Amino acid sequence: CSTLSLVRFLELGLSVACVCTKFPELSYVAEGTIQFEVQQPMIARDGPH
Amino acid sequence: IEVHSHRALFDIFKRFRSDDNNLYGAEFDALLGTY
C-alpha cells in the first residue's frame, strides 16, 4: 500500500508572510465592504501649509 | 437591497486611551509618557 504523508501549513516556512486568523461568520458578513484605511506619514515642511 | 459597509477591524494593540488627559481636565504631571 502507500500512506498519505500529510503536511501542516503552520509548520511550513511560508507562514511567516501572512497572519492567519479564523473568522467564522465571514461569509455572512461578506455581503458588505469592510473598508479600513491604514496611514500615511508626512514631513513637517517649513512655510505655512 | 442597497448593500452597505461594516465596522472595520481594529488592531488588538490599539492603545489610543488618551482621553484620560482629554476627558474633562488634563493632569500633565505624570500621566504623560504612557501615550
Binding site: 509548520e11 | 482621553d19 476627558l23
Partner: peptide
C-alpha cells in the same frame, strides 16, 4: 473578537535560515 459599540475612553520545526 466581535465587540459591539461598547467602548472604553510555539514549537521547534526544521527549516533553513
Amino acid at each position: 473578537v466581535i465587540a459591539n459599540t461598547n467602548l472604553v475612553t510555539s514549537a521547534r520545526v526544521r527549516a533553513d535560515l
